[PDB]
Amino acid sequence: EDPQLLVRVRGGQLRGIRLKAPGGPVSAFLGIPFAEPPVGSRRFMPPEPKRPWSGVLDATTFQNVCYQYVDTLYPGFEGTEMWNPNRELSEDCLYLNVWTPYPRPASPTPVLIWIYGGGFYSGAASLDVYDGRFLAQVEGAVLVSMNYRVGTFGFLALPGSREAPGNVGLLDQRLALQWVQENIAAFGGDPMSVTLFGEAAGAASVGMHILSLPSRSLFHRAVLQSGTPNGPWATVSAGEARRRATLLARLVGCNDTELIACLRTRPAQDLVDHEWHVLPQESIFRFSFVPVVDGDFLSDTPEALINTGDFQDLQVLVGVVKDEGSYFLVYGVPGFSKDNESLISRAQFLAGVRIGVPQASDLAAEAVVLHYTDWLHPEDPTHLRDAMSAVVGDHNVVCPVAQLAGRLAAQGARVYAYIFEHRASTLTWPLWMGVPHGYEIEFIFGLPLDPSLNYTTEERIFAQRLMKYWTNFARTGDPNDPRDSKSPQWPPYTTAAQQYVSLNLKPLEVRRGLRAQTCAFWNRFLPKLLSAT
Amino acid sequence: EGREDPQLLVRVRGGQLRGIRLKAPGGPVSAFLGIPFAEPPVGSRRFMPPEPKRPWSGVLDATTFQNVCYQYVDTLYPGFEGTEMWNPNRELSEDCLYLNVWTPYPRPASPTPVLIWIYGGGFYSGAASLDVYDGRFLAQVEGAVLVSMNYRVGTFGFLALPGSREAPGNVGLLDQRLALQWVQENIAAFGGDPMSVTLFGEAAGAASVGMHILSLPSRSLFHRAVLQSGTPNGPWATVSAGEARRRATLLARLVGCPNDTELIACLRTRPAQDLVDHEWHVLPQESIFRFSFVPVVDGDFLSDTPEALINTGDFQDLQVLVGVVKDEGSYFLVYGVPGFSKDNESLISRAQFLAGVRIGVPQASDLAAEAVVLHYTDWLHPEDPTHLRDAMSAVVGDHNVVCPVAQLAGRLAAQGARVYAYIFEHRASTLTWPLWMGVPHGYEIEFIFGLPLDPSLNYTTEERIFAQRLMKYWTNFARTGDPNDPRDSKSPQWPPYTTAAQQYVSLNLKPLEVRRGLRAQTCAFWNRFLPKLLSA
Numbered sequence A: 001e002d003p004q005l006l007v008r009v010r011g012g013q014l015r016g017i018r019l020k021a022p023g024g025p026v027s028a029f030l031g032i033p034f035a036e037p038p039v040g041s042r043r044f045m046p047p048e049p050k051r052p053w054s055g056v057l058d059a060t061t062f063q064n065v066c067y068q069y070v071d072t073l074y075p076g077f078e079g080t081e082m083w084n085p086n087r088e089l090s091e092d093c094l095y096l097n098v099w100t101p102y103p104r105p106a107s108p109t110p111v112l113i114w115i116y117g118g119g120f121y122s123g124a125a126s127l128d129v130y131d132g133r134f135l136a137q138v139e140g141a142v143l144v145s146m147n148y149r150v151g152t153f154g155f156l157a158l159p160g161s162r163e164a165p166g167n168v169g170l171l172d173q174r175l176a177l178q179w180v181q182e183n184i185a186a187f188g189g190d191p192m193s194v195t196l197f198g199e200a201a202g203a204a205s206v207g208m209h210i211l212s213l214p215s216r217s218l219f220h221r222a223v224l225q226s227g228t229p230n231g232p233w234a235t236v237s238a239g240e241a242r243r244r245a246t247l248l249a250r251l252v253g254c255n256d257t258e259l260i261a262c263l264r265t266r267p268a269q270d271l272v273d274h275e276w277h278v279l280p281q282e283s284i285f286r287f288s289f290v291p292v293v294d295g296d297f298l299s300d301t302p303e304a305l306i307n308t309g310d311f312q313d314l315q316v317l318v319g320v321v322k323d324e325g326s327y328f329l330v331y332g333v334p335g336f337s338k339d340n341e342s343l344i345s346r347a348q349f350l351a352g353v354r355i356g357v358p359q360a361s362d363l364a365a366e367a368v369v370l371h372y373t374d375w376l377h378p379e380d381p382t383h384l385r386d387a388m389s390a391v392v393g394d395h396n397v398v399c400p401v402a403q404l405a406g407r408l409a410a411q412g413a414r415v416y417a418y419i420f421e422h423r424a425s426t427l428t429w430p431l432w433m434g435v436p437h438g439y440e441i442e443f444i445f446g447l448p449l450d451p452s453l454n455y456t457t458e459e460r461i462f463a464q465r466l467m468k469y470w471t472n473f474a475r476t477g478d479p480n481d482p483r484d485s486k487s488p489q490w491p492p493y494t495t496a497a498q499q500y501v502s503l504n505l506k507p508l509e510v511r512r513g514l515r516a517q518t519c520a521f522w523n524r525f526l527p528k529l530l531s532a533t
Numbered sequence B: 001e002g003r004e005d006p007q008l009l010v011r012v013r014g015g016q017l018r019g020i021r022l023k024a025p026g027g028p029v030s031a032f033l034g035i036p037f038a039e040p041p042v043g044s045r046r047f048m049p050p051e052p053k054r055p056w057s058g059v060l061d062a063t064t065f066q067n068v069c070y071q072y073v074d075t076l077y078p079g080f081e082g083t084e085m086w087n088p089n090r091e092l093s094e095d096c097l098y099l100n101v102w103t104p105y106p107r108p109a110s111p112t113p114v115l116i117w118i119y120g121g122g123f124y125s126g127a128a129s130l131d132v133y134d135g136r137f138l139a140q141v142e143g144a145v146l147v148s149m150n151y152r153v154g155t156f157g158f159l160a161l162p163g164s165r166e167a168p169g170n171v172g173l174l175d176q177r178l179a180l181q182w183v184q185e186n187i188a189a190f191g192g193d194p195m196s197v198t199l200f201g202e203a204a205g206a207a208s209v210g211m212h213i214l215s216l217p218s219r220s221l222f223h224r225a226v227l228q229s230g231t232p233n234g235p236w237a238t239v240s241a242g243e244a245r246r247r248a249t250l251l252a253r254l255v256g257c258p259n260d261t262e263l264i265a266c267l268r269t270r271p272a273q274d275l276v277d278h279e280w281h282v283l284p285q286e287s288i289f290r291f292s293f294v295p296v297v298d299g300d301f302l303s304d305t306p307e308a309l310i311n312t313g314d315f316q317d318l319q320v321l322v323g324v325v326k327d328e329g330s331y332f333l334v335y336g337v338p339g340f341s342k343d344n345e346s347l348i349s350r351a352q353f354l355a356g357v358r359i360g361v362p363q364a365s366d367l368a369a370e371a372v373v374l375h376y377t378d379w380l381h382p383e384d385p386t387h388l389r390d391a392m393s394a395v396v397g398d399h400n401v402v403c404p405v406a407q408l409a410g411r412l413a414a415q416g417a418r419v420y421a422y423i424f425e426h427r428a429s430t431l432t433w434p435l436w437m438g439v440p441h442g443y444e445i446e447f448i449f450g451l452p453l454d455p456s457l458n459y460t461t462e463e464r465i466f467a468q469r470l471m472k473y474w475t476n477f478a479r480t481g482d483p484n485d486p487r488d489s490k491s492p493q494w495p496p497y498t499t500a501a502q503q504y505v506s507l508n509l510k511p512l513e514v515r516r517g518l519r520a521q522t523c524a525f526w527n528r529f530l531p532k533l534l535s536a
């Protein structure tokens, strides 16, 4: 019995496991329950805290993945499979994971809490790209990750109902945050220095905690990678949530109480079987069950809340990858595949814009087509294929990030912004997709430090830089290394100067204006258009 | 005669003429100035098509420029060369339908390609007698035969009650056409070749050239065309019949007149100055780069809108040279956008930019206007008053000249034309407008006409070499339909503009440089998106 691996939390005693990182050992405490299993009558309900347990609880292995859709597009292909469940699926899934240095930190240590993405319909904290041992070992971080409910189980809402009030997967996250406040000191973490970080739906999630008061007392700084609470996909109105839940109910054969009662009788997979039959249009970058503007967790729309918020004592790191849109084109737009170069026709480009901007009127779609067409090379298939990716990336991620970045800065936040431009040498998706959505994550987590993964030396040194920016941000709210004059400074993003940095193999470069002209189109003109069209 | 210069006596259909020997820097040229080509359009003949000149007896003195057609005189900046150079330099009269011919001295031996100039000035102003339209240098240096005509402007040229007998519209264009017919019948007497006639014009003059391309009866009267900083398509060059009627009727009210016969009869009693004095009160909006009396779509001279005619025309037989100056819009800002002056740097606020967009795009709805502001804003520096000033200039230049030209060039090339395109980017060293205006609308003309060859005008040496190059491109185009020198083969070539490659050339003090796409992205906004906005 190794006493570094024995921890007493409020609910009782835990035994972790010593893991091998390249540089030395780390302590891992995996599969720690933070809620009563949300099963049976508890399906669609807010989480309750985990009852205390007897003896020593085994925290040496990852727990089950929350019940979710499993991708079939390309069976056996790493590029897709690396996001799929790597443990058994279960509704009993509300567990979290802590990595700390071994031996446990001598003094209170800043805590990073990771919130995974997956369109709010998928994901797990157990995926290889979310492995906390490298940050723990190399930077001395205390790293936490939690499972939260996805799909119908986390986000099916009959707004105003007692029994499916909405947003319960966000409440799972909040409960894990409260758990860290109450317990993390036992592991050597500092509950007074907690930084949330997440990517895509997880970044959206972090943003929603920024915009929901009860969560604000549970963390100090935030990182939003390739996602925002504002924007076209991260939330639905109460009326639309109700529509989709009643449609799903109808499709599985089901007074809210009577309707939800019958949904609870249904096997998990029966619900997943009809998850993708409830969206209003043929779309990509659109998810059926997502956070709802309930007037409770979210008191108003994210837009309203970011415009009117006071963000004075907040620090935020935000950014995007170079090719946010490409990944999504192969899941919906005719002409696109990982197995060819996806050179497309102009006709195919117009059709793809209707699918990528599903809420666009005929005229708005035309405006999108006209803005993104290169009028020097209007029928060039390479240009049209890349234009399609940009439409999707800009509309869904880049322009929402620019918007958020600017509102936070204007309203007193300390903001830092990046664009991530390195394509991993070991990437299995084709070259045309460039640096796709999700593919900075393996670098921030420091996976290239594992020599068995076959990254280059240059990538390892890069990963080390990124780990430093992130953990320095966690420590001080400023990604800049205070043990460095030599390396170029990362300036705060401001609405005036609009400075952001490029994260790539070359040293930091400072740039101005995150797609400024194109995002004025999406952020300023299109709204005016359709609030008139 | 007996003691007169025998090389200055020429006969035309209407009778004998006596011209004058003028000095060009390189040597003498022959000028026949003030040749009547129509009966004076005065009295009962105001607003009516021109009738051809009845023959005169004896020798008509053709040694001085004749009257300028009755028109508005600019007094925005009295005594200032930049404005006065465009103002009338002879007496204003409704008796003004005269033309001018410059030829080599002695007159050429064999039939010589002819250039016909059509002036601009908003269809409300201009004269063939202005110094910048002096044909002596082209005639002497290139051996050209050059012809310029006065044509009626403003109400006199363009006021219309469409469908009427007494004011059918487009009579100023018919003035131009009669001058073209005159050239066909008479130019051989001067040594010109009526089988090689190239029209060229700037601004409203270029729009006029384009309307002759689009009007069948005009097309037998020339072979090739140059359109400088203007087009028949676009927001200003024409009005609909209903809009012409409304403007004509309002003007009649304003001067104390209101059945068409009766209304026109009463207009014909008004002093010409009374019409000019009320001419600017009939525009539908507060505006710049809009003119009250312009060509009307009458279903006669213009059988359909120019937009429709360029979309469906067959232009296989056509060779055209078209282009724009670097800063088409700047000139117009000082005539009505608050914040703008020739006497300061005209740095404006963002509020002043939105107000200026409404004046510069007066037909635009609120949504259209914000589309324009959003497109033209620099979102890295959305309140920089230097960018905002230059954006205002670009808005007006792009909307009225650059994108209409881009579109004209595109359609003509698609429909069979041989098109050559330029941007003119040299600012005259002697320009009296402020530096912020750049290369303003109309400031290429003095170079094409070769004024820098006159050393008394104080242009630089480089400017003189430059003018000689331009004169060569223009006259080579007149001669052959191709601006390229057939026996210079070392100097960089000017390729035709095509829809595929969208090639055009920079005209400046450096050797020709080929560029691609004439404001391709921005012109897609004006030419494709804004229209679609309108349709709902």
Ligand SMILES: C[N+](C)(C)CCOC(=O)CCC(=O)OCC[N+](C)(C)C
Binding pocket: A078, A081, A082, A083, A084, A085, A086, A127, A128, A129, A426, A442, A447, A453
């Ligand atoms: C099918 N399954 C869901 C049960 C396991 C999927 O396996 C992986 O992709 C794990 C390896 C992985 O994460 O791939 C990316 C590794 N990388 C980025 C270091 C190359």
Ligand SMILES: C[N+](C)(C)CCOC(=O)CCC(=O)OCC[N+](C)(C)C
Binding pocket: A069, A071, A083, A117, A118, A119, A200, A276, A285, A327, A328, A331, A437, A438, A439
């Ligand atoms: C976490 N990650 C975002 C980095 C990987 C997500 O990958 C996707 O499948 C994105 C494409 C997508 O959302 O497709 C939905 C497929 N559908 C409709 C079958 C569920």
Ligand SMILES: C[N+](C)(C)CCOC(=O)CCC(=O)OCC[N+](C)(C)C
Binding pocket: B081, B084, B085, B086, B087, B088, B089, B131, B132, B430, B431, B446, B451, B457
């Ligand atoms: C007063 N007026 C209306 C009777 C005549 C105005 O005179 C001029 O501006 C003639 C000078 C001129 O055309 O100068 C501009 C061209 N440049 C630079 C070659 C002299």
Ligand SMILES: C[N+](C)(C)CCOC(=O)CCC(=O)OCC[N+](C)(C)C
Binding pocket: B072, B074, B086, B120, B121, B122, B202, B203, B204, B280, B289, B331, B332, B335, B441, B442
């Ligand atoms: C070179 N050019 C003769 C072709 C144009 C220069 O003349 C102008 O006045 C341009 C500005 C303008 O058109 O103002 C008209 C408005 N008005 C009549 C009220 C002065």
